[PDB]
Design a protein around this nucleic acid. Structure first.
Ligand SMILES: [Mg+2]
Length: 1044
RNA sequence: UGCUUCACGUAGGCCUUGGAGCCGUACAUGGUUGUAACAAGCCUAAGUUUGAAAGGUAAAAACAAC
């Protein structure tokens, strides 16, 4: 054991050198006014510490210039007469933040790994298989595009290698935490080596003198992020500016240029923060980044200096709410309704032009004002512009909450885990067809809201019973059918409708089932001429079976000149609406790539038709499905996938004939936006070129290349009747609002309206109850201010698409708040009794009624909520019997990170501590958050005091501590500090040390140390103050700190 | 001490998500050729909250060859 004991001496020397050199916990304070203390520069920190333990130290430092000055030597901007007052806390060393960050990172990552493990166990140690599919959803900010492409192809080859990599990086993170939480430790995880011995190793397999692949992965990720930030900052640099953000960009590019994974022979400070913020939560990484960096509120360019550490982070998927579920749905509906929608229908272009002019004129008037109360008096006219408008999702959520979907099947979005299960679980063409589809049918439950919205449509499945057979029929329900379903629910409870004969109650699900059966039985026996039920004969049965010509007619030139013109103006409209945006490189991905690919496909099709190739010669020269997926993947991430071998393998070779018009310009520009403007300009030039060559000789020239076809064939009816029978669509007017109280009076009152529909009746009924609609403001306060260019006869151009779309807005808003009102019935137990005022015409030169003061939903969105903070245990267990607390929480700060923060700290601060209820009588979220974060700000101070005390303990008796790590049939872990060793201990050593005590325990000190390690709120505030005061006095006895 | 940060702790302080041109979960998102526009859009009635009927564009969802 001579080599073993020699390993002990060399590890002891390494540990001693590490403790002497790299285990510095030295705090440091800023310059300016903080460094002006001079003599009390020698004595500041403990003078703060006593202030934050209870002692009365007055801030009697009032140093003044004491006179009037003329020279620049005075130069002090001392307009704030108060001094430091020993309440602000100084910057601590990186080791304390790293210790807390690695402990929190190991906690949250072990929690996420355990959750992924139980999810994959119930759904059917490196998380191999679909375990890494969930873990790769979680690991970065959704950066699993290569893994998604691999499971879409079916390779399942990168998953095992990525699983090893994840296991190795988890062990590296665990060893980094175990180093950083302790004082007496080998310098292993900082300078990646094998000081353990490489032969005597009881499953401490950190590196085994071969896992420099962990280092390779670390430099790969660090350098990828570094050159990505260099490219981004280069793109910002040459932008326009007032020579002020140019110097800021120069400072940022000075900071990023540097860093590196290796400094001297160690990982150094930046890469440790990179690993920690990679393994942390998003808010935890942001907090540790803004504690590490001196910048408090990052603005302009400097967000990138934060973002360098917060680019990866963790995903943190959505949370399942159990107490305030309906209140959260009400808040979401109100947040949707508090915003002006952005309709893309033209002839509303002056509306949004005036909206943009008004908003740009008032956002500059928001500045150059005084205080915060006068700012809102000018900010109140700025109209928010909405994001989503998911009317179909909210309708289907209302039908899901009341369990109105029974005996059905609803298409839901496809997950990568479902794709992998379909891959491992396997007529081959049926499986190939199901593989291409991105939706799946399953029985709807309450806890499922992944509804498939494909161009505002939803998909249903019905089980009609022709001759006892179980023929499943897919439908496609229009968004104006579910809206009428919600109306029939919301007017008459226990919904029913009556038909033309015997006037029964028809139970709309049974109406849909009978309609599917009747459509099947009518398609099976032609009958496309008679009307169906009472709808029409042409509102069902499309033009493939109704209108037909016996002989396929010759394609005329005017049809081609119309198709070319409509494609040209559609491309021009897209180009103008993309150039109108402030950041053009964020608009679309399915639309920008498809324009380029349709351009190259049309150019290839013309070049291959005029050269007269074959039928199969087109297909094998084109892009296959896997080749399409590769093309879309390498075009979406063109800045990342530019220099790889696959890019030049599939683009510059193997496919040079197809991609011919773009390879000339692909060697100059280095972005997706670079290869988009050239392609759309080439498309416009090509359409303008071939528009003038559609003479009668070149009629077949621009035929099958453009896919222009006339009407159908008479013989092609029986084949269509066997494929349009299943998978047809449901029109919006299948159900009739005949027996609703007020229908006949409305039809009698509105008789000189020849173009009326049931949506006017829905508008009248839901406006009888009172409610805003987002369109009364649009046509009574902003509309009369704008002058419109006329038509040849009409006073406004584009009438039939101007008002109708507005009506298509209006009743939809009158739907949505009604649903929200229902959730208030599920929230407080009482009806919504607030009265809403009407609106009047403006008839003035300017606009006087502010959107933020006249929209009632925007006023409700800023006024309080009720909540229940009953505590929750681990896993998906039920709420335990605990006292229920109510606080006043704003609806804005009611998102998912509040749902994490509440169970993290708010319940333990309400229960264990004793807060005051305030003037109102209920707690407020702002004061609670301020008190919790103020009580957690001193926590790294606590760990600094503990580390200084332990360093002073282990610096003496170093041979005594080293002699009690001999062997355990091999090399032990060289760390001794664990505060619970059975031979000599360390909490007992501090317990019988110079710690004065009257009410104390060694177990209490261990509990306090575990709490300051893991950032958990203290059980008793008073005992924690006693421990803090004892440690402050013990540190001040031996002159341990640099403040002595 | 040190390759570091210049800032006196905590909470506050909103149009179009610039700094993420390579993020992301609320979907026309899996290709070529023929058949496919009932559903969803987009244009055509109106100085006002009239989505009917009609006339063009329009391929979401589907069938047969690779
Ligand atoms: Mg119509």
């Amino acid at each position: 054991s001579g080599k073993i004991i020699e390993k002990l001496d060399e590890l002891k020397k390494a540990t001693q050198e590490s403790i002497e050199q790299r285990k510095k916990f030295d705090y440091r304070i800023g310059k300016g006014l903080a460094d002006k203390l001079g003599n009390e520069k020698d004595s500041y920190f403990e003078k703060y510490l006593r202030k934050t333990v209870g002692e009365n130290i007055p801030p009697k430092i009032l140093v003044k210039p004491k006179g009037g000055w003329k020279t620049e030597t005075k130069g002090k901007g001392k307009d704030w007469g108060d001094k430091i007052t020993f309440a602000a806390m100084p910057q601590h060393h990186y080791n304390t933040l790293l210790a807390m960050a690695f402990t929190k990172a190991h906690k949250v990552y072990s929690d996420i790994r355990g959750k992924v493990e139980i999810d994959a166990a119930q759904y059917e140690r490196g998380l191999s298989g679909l375990e890494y599919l969930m873990m790769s959803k979680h690991l970065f900010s959704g950066k699993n595009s290569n893994i998604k492409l691999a499971v879409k192809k079916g390779e399942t080859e990168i998953l095992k290698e990525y699983a090893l990599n994840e296991k190795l990086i988890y062990t590296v993170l665990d060893e980094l935490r175990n180093f950083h939480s302790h004082i007496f430790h080998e310098p292993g995880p900082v300078s990646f080596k094998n000081l353990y011995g490489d032969e005597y190793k009881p499953e401490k397999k950190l590196t085994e003198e071969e896992w420099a692949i962990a280092r390779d992965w670390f430099v790969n990720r660090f350098n990828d992020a570094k050159e990505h930030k260099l490219k981004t900052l280069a793109k910002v640099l040459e932008r326009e500016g007032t020579t002020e953000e140019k110097e800021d960009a120069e400072k940022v590019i000075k900071t990023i240029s540097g860093y590196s994974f290796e400094y001297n022979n160690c990982i150094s400070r930046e890469a440790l923060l990179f690993i920690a913020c990679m393994f942390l939560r998003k808010s935890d990484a942001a907090y540790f980044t803004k504690k590490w960096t001196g910048m408090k509120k990052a603005e302009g360019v400097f967000k990138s200096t934060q973002s360098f550490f917060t680019d990866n982070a963790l995903k943190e998927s959505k949370s399942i709410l159990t107490l305030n579920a309906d209140l959260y749905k009400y808040r979401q509906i109100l947040g949707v309704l508090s915003t002006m929608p952005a309709m893309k229908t033209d002839s509303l272009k002056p509306f949004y032009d005036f909206i943009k002019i008004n908003n740009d004129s008032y956002s500059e008037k928001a500045e150059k004002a005084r205080s915060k109360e006068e700012k809102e008096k000018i900010q109140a006219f700025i109209i928010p512009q909405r994001k989503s408008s998911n009317y179909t999702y909210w309708f289907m959520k209302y039908l899901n909450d009341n369990k109105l979907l029974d005996g059905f099947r609803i298409a839901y979005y496809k997950t990568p885990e479902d794709r992998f299960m379909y891959l491992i679980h396997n007529s081959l063409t049926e499986i190939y067809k199901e593989t291409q589809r991105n939706f799946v049918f399953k029985v709807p439950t309450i806890e499922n809201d992944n509804f498939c919205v494909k161009k505002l449509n939803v998909f249903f499945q019905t089980d009609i019973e022709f001759n006892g057979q179980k023929i499943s029929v897919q439908l496609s329900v229009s968004p104006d059918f579910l809206m009428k379903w919600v109306f029939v629910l919301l007017i008459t409870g226990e919904d029913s409708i009556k038909n033309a004969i015997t006037e029964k109650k028809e139970k709309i699900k049974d109406i849909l089932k009978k309609y599917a059966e009747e459509y099947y039985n009518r398609c099976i026996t032609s009958n496309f001429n008679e009307p169906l039920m009472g709808l029409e004969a042409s509102k069902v049965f499309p033009s493939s079976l109704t209108s037909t010509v016996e002989i396929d007619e010759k394609i005329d030139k005017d049809k081609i000149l119309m198709r070319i013109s409509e494609k040209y103006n559609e491309l021009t409209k897209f180009d103008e609406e993309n150039k109108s945006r402030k950041a053009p490189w964020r608009f679309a991905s399915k639309r920008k790539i498809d324009i380029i690919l349709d351009y190259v496909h049309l150019v290839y099709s013309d070049r291959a038709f005029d050269e007269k190739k074959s039928v199969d010669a087109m297909r094998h020269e084109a892009l296959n499905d896997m080749e399409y997926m590769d093309t879309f993947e390498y075009l979406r991430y063109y800045g990342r996938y530019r220099e790889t071998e696959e890019f030049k393998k599939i683009f510059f070779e193997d496919k040079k004939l197809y991609f011919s018009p773009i390879l000339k310009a692909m060697k100059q520009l280095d972005s997706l936006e670079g290869v988009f403007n050239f392609a759309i300009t080439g498309f416009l030039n090509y359409l303008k070129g071939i528009q003038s060559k559609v003479t009668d000789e070149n009629t077949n020239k621009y035929g099958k290349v453009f896919k222009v076809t006339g009407k159908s064939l008479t013989s092609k009816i029986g084949h269509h009747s066997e494929m349009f029978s299943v998978n047809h669509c449901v029109p919006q007017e299948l159900i009739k609002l005949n027996d609703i109280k007020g229908y006949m009076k409305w039809k009698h009152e509105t008789k000189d309206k020849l173009w009326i529909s049931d949506f006017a009746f829905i508008r009248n009924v839901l406006e009888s109850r009172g409610g805003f609609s987002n369109t009364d403001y649009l046509m009574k306060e902003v509309m009369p201010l704008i002058t419109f260019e006329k038509n040849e006869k009409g006073s406004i151009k584009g009438n039939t698409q101007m008002f109708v779309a507005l009506s298509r807005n209006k009743t939809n808003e009158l739907m949505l708040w009604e649903i929200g009102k229902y959730y208030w019935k599920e929230a407080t137990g009482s009806e919504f009794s607030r009265l809403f005022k009407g609106l009047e015409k403006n008839t003035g030169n300017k606009i006087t009624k502010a959107y933020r003061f006249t929209n009632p939903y925007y006023t409700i969105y800023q006024e309080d909520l009720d909540i229940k903070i009953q505590r929750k245990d681990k896993k998906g267990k039920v709420i335990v019997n605990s006292p229920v607390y109510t606080i006043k929480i704003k609806p804005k700060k009611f998102d998912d990170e509040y749902q994490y923060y509440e169970q993290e700290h708010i319940v333990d601060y309400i229960e264990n501590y004793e807060p005051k209820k305030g003037i109102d009588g209920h707690w407020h979220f702002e004061e609670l958050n301020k008190k919790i974060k103020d009580e957690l700000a001193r926590y790294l101070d606590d760990i600094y005091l503990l580390m200084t005390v332990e360093k002073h303990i282990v610096q003496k008796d170093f041979d005594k501590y080293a002699s009690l790590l001999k062997e355990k049939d091999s090399k032990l872990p060289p760390y001794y500090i664990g505060f619970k060793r059975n031979d000599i201990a360390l909490n007992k050593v501090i317990f019988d040390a110079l710690k004065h005590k009257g009410s104390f325990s060694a177990d209490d000190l261990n509990i306090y140390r575990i709490n300051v390690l893991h950032q958990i709120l203290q059980p008793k505030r008073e005992k924690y103050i006693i421990i803090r005061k004892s440690l402050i006095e013990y540190c001040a006895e031996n002159k341990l700190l640099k403040t002595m």
